[PDB]
Amino acid sequence: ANPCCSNPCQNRGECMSTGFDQYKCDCTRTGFYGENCTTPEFLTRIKLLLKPTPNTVHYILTHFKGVWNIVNNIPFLRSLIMKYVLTSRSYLIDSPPTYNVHYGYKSWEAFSNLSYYTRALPPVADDCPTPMGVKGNKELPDSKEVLEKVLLRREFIPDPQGSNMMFAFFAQHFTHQFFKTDHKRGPGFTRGLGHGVDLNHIYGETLDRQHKLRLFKDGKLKYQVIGGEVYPPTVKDTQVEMIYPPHIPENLQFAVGQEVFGLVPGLMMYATIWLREHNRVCDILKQEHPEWGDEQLFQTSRLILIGETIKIVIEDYVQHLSGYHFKLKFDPELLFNQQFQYQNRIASEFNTLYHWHPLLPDTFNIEDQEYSFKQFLYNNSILLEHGLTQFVESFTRQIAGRVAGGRNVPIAVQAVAKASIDQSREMKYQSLNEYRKRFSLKPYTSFEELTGEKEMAAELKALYSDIDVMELYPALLVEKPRPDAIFGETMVELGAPFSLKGLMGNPICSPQYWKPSTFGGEVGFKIINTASIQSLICNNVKGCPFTSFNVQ
Amino acid sequence: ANPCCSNPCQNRGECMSTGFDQYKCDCTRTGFYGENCTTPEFLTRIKLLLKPTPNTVHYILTHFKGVWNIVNNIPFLRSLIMKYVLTSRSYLIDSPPTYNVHYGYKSWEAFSNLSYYTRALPPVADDCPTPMGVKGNKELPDSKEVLEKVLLRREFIPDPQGSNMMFAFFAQHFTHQFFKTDHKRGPGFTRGLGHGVDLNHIYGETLDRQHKLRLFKDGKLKYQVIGGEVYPPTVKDTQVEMIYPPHIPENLQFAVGQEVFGLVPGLMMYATIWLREHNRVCDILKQEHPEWGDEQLFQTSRLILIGETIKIVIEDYVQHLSGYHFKLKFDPELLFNQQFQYQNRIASEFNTLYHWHPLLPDTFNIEDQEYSFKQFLYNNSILLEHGLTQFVESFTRQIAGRVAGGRNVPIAVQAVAKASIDQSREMKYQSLNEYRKRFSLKPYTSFEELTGEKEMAAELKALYSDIDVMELYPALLVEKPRPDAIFGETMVELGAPFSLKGLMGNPICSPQYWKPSTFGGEVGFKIINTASIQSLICNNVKGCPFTSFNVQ
Numbered sequence A, B: 001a002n003p004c005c006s007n008p009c010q011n012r013g014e015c016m017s018t019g020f021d022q023y024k025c026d027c028t029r030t031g032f033y034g035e036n037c038t039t040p041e042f043l044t045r046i047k048l049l050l051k052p053t054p055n056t057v058h059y060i061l062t063h064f065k066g067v068w069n070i071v072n073n074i075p076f077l078r079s080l081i082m083k084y085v086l087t088s089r090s091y092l093i094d095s096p097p098t099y100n101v102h103y104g105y106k107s108w109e110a111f112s113n114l115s116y117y118t119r120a121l122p123p124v125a126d127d128c129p130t131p132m133g134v135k136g137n138k139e140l141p142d143s144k145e146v147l148e149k150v151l152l153r154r155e156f157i158p159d160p161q162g163s164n165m166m167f168a169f170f171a172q173h174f175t176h177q178f179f180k181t182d183h184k185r186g187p188g189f190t191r192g193l194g195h196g197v198d199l200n201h202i203y204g205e206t207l208d209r210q211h212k213l214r215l216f217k218d219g220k221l222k223y224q225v226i227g228g229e230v231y232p233p234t235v236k237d238t239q240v241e242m243i244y245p246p247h248i249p250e251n252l253q254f255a256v257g258q259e260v261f262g263l264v265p266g267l268m269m270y271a272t273i274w275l276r277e278h279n280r281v282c283d284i285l286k287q288e289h290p291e292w293g294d295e296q297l298f299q300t301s302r303l304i305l306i307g308e309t310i311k312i313v314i315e316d317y318v319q320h321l322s323g324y325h326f327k328l329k330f331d332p333e334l335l336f337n338q339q340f341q342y343q344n345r346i347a348s349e350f351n352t353l354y355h356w357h358p359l360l361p362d363t364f365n366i367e368d369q370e371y372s373f374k375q376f377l378y379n380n381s382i383l384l385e386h387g388l389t390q391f392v393e394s395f396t397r398q399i400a401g402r403v404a405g406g407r408n409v410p411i412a413v414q415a416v417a418k419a420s421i422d423q424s425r426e427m428k429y430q431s432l433n434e435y436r437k438r439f440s441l442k443p444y445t446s447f448e449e450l451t452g453e454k455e456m457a458a459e460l461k462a463l464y465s466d467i468d469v470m471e472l473y474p475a476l477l478v479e480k481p482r483p484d485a486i487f488g489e490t491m492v493e494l495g496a497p498f499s500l501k502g503l504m505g506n507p508i509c510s511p512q513y514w515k516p517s518t519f520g521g522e523v524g525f526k527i528i529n530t531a532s533i534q535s536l537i538c539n540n541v542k543g544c545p546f547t548s549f550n551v552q
């Protein structure tokens, strides 16, 4: 009965009920006017005629390698291009943030309460006749049916971009500092109150936890030595809370910032590497600053490791995921003459789209061995047995799975894919197509257009009946990929805005933070500005093994 | 010890030790270079020649009323001037914030921990030889001596700008939503985690307190009716905690957003007015929106009151306080094509400069009664006896004290004035002249330049010896006022940047919030954009008594 249930306002206009069964669209600064904000203003008409499609842009960015080679070596051109991607991407995000799972209208509660994930689109009102608003049936199709018919792996589909397991575990490790759903509260709530790249997954969310992880000598984090190699310390040494099944022996209960990182040896690999990187940066800072005390060594190192992280995420991780020949750049100076909000609130939909469980192989391959899921999970003896070097060498060789294209979620994790479907519904997400318009994409007109084939498309039609009723999460995993690419259109177009805002929103990117003295001088500043996935592994893993995010 | 103890880096350069006995300045984006950032850039030399002093500017803005009359009646110019004041003042504030009482260098802890007040200048480090760095004696002069010789009132000195008790109590009430020192932790800590104009003093800091204060019908706040007049509910009725001495009867224990507001009838006056205003806007929104539930009516009203609050503070309060003939304007649209961070962190120094107790008279005059402090404190009987209409009429007629100029702190509050001095020192504040530099002011070269007279200057010179050792807080209350002004230069030049950033940094001012739909349509939007202290009183106080921030 809520008259805004049909989601009638278009082009980012805001709907508001003006009576028990009438509505009004606020078209302020949409660039359109009219009842539904669909009548464009002159300048908008021109802008929309000169805007190429995302797929048009993807082609140009993934072809003409010789030209981009030249462009990449003309700094002012490279800077101009990257400046434009940063600002044009980021305008797609609401900042300061607006809606959440409980608020489909702006409120001081939705603004102020940091425990919520925010919402790119408001939730469908409780009193709407259907789950998606007014379209479709009274109930969405059975999530188990959806799961089994179009999401579950039959045969492993390797990523055509050649993403490796160093990449898969990096994505998991990196994102789990800002994806930390509070299950005590509900799926639309977070325990990552920093809402960004604060490295709480290394240092801990709270000061108490951080202080138990710290050595209070030379700015360092506690560690232990086992077989001559540096690993994180134990729960017994540090007294910090971790999630471990009851049978894990005390000596293998490792303590790190993130409480769930001891449950996957690939996560524990990165926790070790970064802890190692933190202590290494303390030694460099102490060399430069014998006057400095423990506190400042610790704090400055943390700032540097945050910079290293954003640097690597942009120039290696996103570089690889995008497939672009254009050389992406981490340079905060790009935004200083530009309008940008140095803040971020993590979006629920960003959490949802980052569920890339199809990346996971059917087995994990370290040296001679091939480990099943049951063997791999909660099992840090494997890390100790093989060591980091072999972990890196092995995971650099092992191909990850393709994410879009359908039917490639491993069964070992099928409950996690079911919960993604079920919790999107619980949180009253709007439909795939509503989210496509939200990020200026053309709605799909059929399931065949979505999938780019006929079989999964036909199964989806039998379940959903109407393309307008298709759900975001399953669409992302079933969408037609770009040519020989890991993702489809929707993943990139919603993902790129959330991601870059979170990276460039950090306070260290603000002009008052982004200078040498923030990071202990030019030596500290250089560490950020020369950081790479290769150098991270080379400085902290014995024998400086080669590494990359793609299978070589 | 620390080589940065002498504050060597000028012009906002940042100082960093580079060894036990050496420093380096980071001159990044200061407009200067050289060892101490004192060598101006070509472009910088030009601006320093063309830039007039704040006093030259103050004269212009407070004279030529005929010329201002015309400017004020030309929308585009008025807007253009107000745009410039906003942007030019806001660039004085670090945003994202930087330092706090425990961190004199940037750290994630000082960024992320919302329980600190931030700092416009870092603290003087613990190992410095003197309180101010290196200058002065090993101890600052006895605070009691400073207080007695130059701060305490002999004879009430009236504000020549004619500020009244309506103004004085608006200031206390408004500011006490964001100045809420957490004495459990210490003077450098706040309970006002919203760090701005969130109206927690009406609605409560925590969800639990808000809920106790809410009626849960039609978006309203609980109230009671005494003698046909609306007042806040009691502690007993709502179980919300208030600070009252034990002898206060239960029927006078009023429960409002801010726990300390029962301490003064003047605060409770405004608490009643604003409670009435919230419930008034609920009625307005209920009329327009019969479809709406209690949550939305409550949330939407709060966003309108925050709007009303910012409107009145700029166009009534700051207008009066500035003494300007130019007509200031609350218009978020002014910043949309400018660079501006929609966030704020409340500074310790802003709290310190806002200790305007010289405003208080020796007795509070209502109707025909002259109440002493003892009689007035924690005495809501006074409010119920006289009523709101009489309070407004009385407080409108009673003049407040001048703040700068010296010797006007009421003796009844001397322990508060001594504390401001003692806490500044505990928080390791830099000197008056450092703060002047920080805010583009010329350092004072004698106590006579500071005071504009000889007697207090000489008292001050015997106590402090060096002008460079002089403290911020006492200086503000002894400073030579502008001609017939309530304040001296330093108060305005530090206070304006902090004030306007807090106002405009609110998210309701951001592009995506500032549209009709946020406030329930044009009718609610209109409530913000026509608000005034007069209309606040007229809509909510019986008989629509005339009011103003100045004596008639």
Ligand code: HEM
Residues within 6 Å of the ligand: A168, A169, A171, A172, A175, A179, A180, A181, A264, A266, A351, A354, A355, A356, A357, A359, A360, A377, A413, A416, A419, A420
């Ligand atoms: C390596 C084996 C992995 C296992 C066993 C695993 C398993 C899980 C589990 C059990 C959950 C919690 C589900 C729930 O409580 O509803 C989860 C959530 C999640 N997974 Fe994975 N996952 C793996 C790898 C990955 C990878 C490579 C990614 C790629 C980024 C990823 C992304 C996510 C995200 C973003 C969440 C939401 C977490 C939160 O919000 O707290 N996972 N996964």
Ligand code: HEM
Residues within 6 Å of the ligand: B168, B169, B171, B172, B175, B179, B180, B181, B183, B264, B266, B351, B354, B355, B356, B357, B359, B360, B413, B416
């Ligand atoms: C009406 C009579 C007033 C009394 C009895 C009074 C008394 C006090 C006291 C006792 C404190 C210390 C609070 C504490 O340490 O917990 C204080 C602080 C303060 N006063 Fe007043 N004051 C009055 C009026 C005003 C006025 C008119 C202003 C002008 C804005 C003002 C501004 C402040 C500020 C900004 C603080 C610091 C608050 C904090 O850090 O939480 N006061 N006052």
Ligand SMILES: *[C@@H]1O[C@H](CO)[C@@H](O[C@@H]2O[C@H](CO)[C@@H](O)[C@H](O)[C@H]2NC(C)=O)[C@H](O)[C@H]1NC(C)=O
Residues within 6 Å of the ligand: A113, A114, A115, A116, A184, A185, A186, B206, B207, B208
């Ligand atoms: C942020 O929002 C959540 C949801 O309203 C608040 O959590 C609830 O608080 C109430 C009352 O204090 C409890 O009865 C609920 O059980 C809480 N949880 C949930 C899931 O409803 C939370 O307190 C808010 N946080 C802040 C800091 O205001």
Ligand SMILES: *[C@@H]1O[C@H](CO)[C@@H](O[C@@H]2O[C@H](CO)[C@@H](O)[C@H](O)[C@H]2NC(C)=O)[C@H](O)[C@H]1NC(C)=O
Residues within 6 Å of the ligand: A206, A207, A208, B113, B114, B115, B116, B184, B185, B186
């Ligand atoms: C912000 O900083 C303060 C001060 O460091 C923290 O307050 C202290 O917390 C510890 C517990 O970890 C106590 O032992 C102290 O007594 C606390 N108070 C003070 C005044 O030191 C506070 O925990 C921090 N807040 C956050 C969110 O980290």
Ligand SMILES: CC(C)COc1c(Cl)cc2c(c1Cl)O[C@@H](C(F)(F)F)C(C(=O)O)=C2
Residues within 6 Å of the ligand: A085, A089, A318, A319, A321, A322, A328, A487, A491, A492, A493, A494, A495, A496, A497, A499, A500
């Ligand atoms: C979570 C995933 C989707 C994010 O990883 C990506 C991917 Cl896969 C693509 C782009 C992107 C990011 Cl961040 O951001 C930008 C880029 F690469 F140019 F910076 C972009 C563009 O075309 O503007 C495309």
Ligand SMILES: CC(C)COc1c(Cl)cc2c(c1Cl)O[C@@H](C(F)(F)F)C(C(=O)O)=C2
Residues within 6 Å of the ligand: B085, B089, B318, B319, B321, B322, B324, B328, B487, B491, B492, B495, B496, B497, B499, B500
């Ligand atoms: C906390 C107190 C000090 C704030 O009250 C003031 C005062 Cl007293 C003066 C100005 C000011 C504010 Cl806010 O801000 C601006 C104004 F008036 F133009 F908006 C200003 C200017 O010259 O730019 C001067």
Ligand SMILES: CCCCCCCCO[C@@H]1O[C@H](CO)[C@@H](O)[C@H](O)[C@H]1O
Residues within 6 Å of the ligand: B148, B149, B152, B153, B154, B155, B411, B414
């Ligand atoms: C009483 C009108 C003249 C004011 C003179 C102020 C000089 C400071 O005198 C001080 O006054 C304080 C408050 O009364 C007392 O507590 C101190 O004992 C006294 O030294």
Ligand SMILES: *[C@@H]1O[C@H](CO)[C@@H](O)[C@H](O)[C@H]1NC(C)=O
Residues within 6 Å of the ligand: A374, A375, A376, A379, A381, A382, A385
């Ligand atoms: C874990 O791996 C180690 C080393 O291979 C070994 O103790 C055991 O086979 C594994 N445990 C489980 C439960 O698979």
Ligand SMILES: *[C@@H]1O[C@H](CO)[C@@H](O)[C@H](O)[C@H]1NC(C)=O
Residues within 6 Å of the ligand: B374, B375, B376, B379, B381, B382, B383, B385
């Ligand atoms: C409070 O004010 C009343 C008038 O309402 C007055 O009669 C009374 O004596 C005052 N109380 C105290 C404790 O001074």
